[PDB]
Amino acid sequence: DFEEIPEEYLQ
Amino acid sequence: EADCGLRPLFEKKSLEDKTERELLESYI
Amino acid sequence: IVEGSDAEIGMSPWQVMLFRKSPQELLCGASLISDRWVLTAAHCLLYPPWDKNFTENDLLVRIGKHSRTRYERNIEKISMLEKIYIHPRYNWRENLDRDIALMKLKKPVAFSDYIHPVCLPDRETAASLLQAGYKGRVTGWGNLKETGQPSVLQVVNLPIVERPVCKDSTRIRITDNMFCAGYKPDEGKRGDACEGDSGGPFVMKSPFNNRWYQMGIVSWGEGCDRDGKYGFYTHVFRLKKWIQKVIDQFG
Numbered sequence: 001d002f003e004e005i006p007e008e009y010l011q
Numbered sequence: 012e013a014d015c016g017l018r019p020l021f022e023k024k025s026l027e028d029k030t031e032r033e034l035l036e037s038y039i
Numbered sequence: 040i041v042e043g044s045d046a047e048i049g050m051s052p053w054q055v056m057l058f059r060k061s062p063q064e065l066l067c068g069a070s071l072i073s074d075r076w077v078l079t080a081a082h083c084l085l086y087p088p089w090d091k092n093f094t095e096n097d098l099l100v101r102i103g104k105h106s107r108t109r110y111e112r113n114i115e116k117i118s119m120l121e122k123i124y125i126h127p128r129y130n131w132r133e134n135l136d137r138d139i140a141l142m143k144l145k146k147p148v149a150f151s152d153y154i155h156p157v158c159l160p161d162r163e164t165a166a167s168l169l170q171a172g173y174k175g176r177v178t179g180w181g182n183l184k185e186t187g188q189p190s191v192l193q194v195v196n197l198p199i200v201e202r203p204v205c206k207d208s209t210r211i212r213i214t215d216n217m218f219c220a221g222y223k224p225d226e227g228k229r230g231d232a233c234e235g236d237s238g239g240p241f242v243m244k245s246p247f248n249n250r251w252y253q254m255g256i257v258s259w260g261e262g263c264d265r266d267g268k269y270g271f272y273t274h275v276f277r278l279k280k281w282i283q284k285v286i287d288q289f290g
C-alpha cells in the first residue's frame with residue numbers, strides 16, 4: 001500500500 | 012523555538028488557510 | 040479523520056507520521072516541537088493489552104508529508120529515533136491517563152516550507168483557550184470512517200466540550216489530564232479522529248499572538264464520529280513540566 005522508501009533509511 | 016507556530020506558507024507570508032477563521036470566530 | 044477535508048499544502052508543517060519499518064505501515068501521528076524532538080501519544084509506542092511495545096529501531100518518523108502513501112521526494116524527510124521517553128505515570132492499565140511520549144531524533148531535521156515546529160502552550164494561553172465551545176484543529180492520515188483511507192492528510196476543526204458532558208458520555212474514568220472535543224448530536228456538524236490519527240496534534244491558533252499551539256494529543260475514543268461520543272485528548276499543558284524535564288535532561 002505504501003510506496004517503498006529509500007533503502008538508506010532502513011539500514 | 013523562537014518562530015514556533017508560524018507557518019512558512021501561511022503566517023510568514025500573511026496568507027490565511029481556508030478554515031482558520033472558524034477557529035477565531037469560536038474564541039468569544 | 041472522519042468528516043474532515045484535505046489539508047492545504049503546508050497547513051500543518053508540524054505534522055509527523057510514525058512509520059513502522061517492517062511491515063512498512065502507518066502507526067500513528069505525532070508532532071514536531073523542535074528540530075530534534077517529536078511529541079506523540081504513549082499508547083502509540085506502549086500498549087501491553089495489544090502486545091505493543093516498540094523500541095527505537097522498530098520505527099521511523101516522516102516529516103513534511105502530505106500524501107499518505109507516497110514517498111514525497113525532495114519534500115518529506117525521514118528520521119531515525121535516538122530514544123523514546125514515555126511518561127512514567129502513563130496509565131495503560133485503565134484509562135490512558137497521561138498518554139504522552141517524546142521521541143528524540145538521531146539528527147536534527149532541516150526546517151523548510153513543509154517542516155516547522157508547533158508551539159507548546161504556556162499556562163496563560165491554556166487558561167484562555169481551553170474553554171468549552173472554543174475550536175481546535177485535528178489532523179491525520181487515519182481512517183475516514185469507523186467501519187476507507189485517505190489519499191492526503193485530513194483536517195477537521197472541533198469544539199472543546201464541557202467536562203460534565205465529556206464525563207457523562209462514557210463509562211471510562213476521565214481525569215484532569217484529558218479533555219474532550221467534538222460536536223453534540225443537536226449541533227448538526229460532525230467530525231472526529233479515527234484509527235491511525237492517534238498521537239497527532241489538536242492545535243489552536245492564539246488570537247493574541249497569531250501562533251499555533253498544541254493543546255492536545257489524539258488519545259482515545261469509543262468508535263469514531265458516533266453521536267453522543269467525543270474524542271479524548273491528552274492535556275498537553277498539564278503535562279508540560281514532564282516535557283520540559285525530559286528535554287532539559289536529555290536534549
Ligand SMILES: CC(C)(C)c1cc(CC2(N)COC2)no1
Pocket residue numbers: 082083086089132133134135211259260
Ligand atoms: C481508554 C481505553 C478504554 C483504555 C482505550 C484504549 C483504546 C485504544 C487502544 N487500545 C489504546 O491503544 C489503542 N481506546 O480506549
Ligand SMILES: *[C@@H]1O[C@H](CO)[C@@H](O)[C@H](O)[C@H]1NC(C)=O
Pocket residue numbers: 085087092
Ligand atoms: C517494554 O519493553 C521494554 C524493552 O524490552 C522493557 O524494558 C519494558 O519493561 C517494557 N514495558 C512494559 C510495560 O512491558
Ligand code: NA
Pocket residue numbers: 206207208209210211
Ligand atoms: Na460517565
Ligand code: NA
Pocket residue numbers: 221222231264265266267268269
Ligand atoms: Na460524536
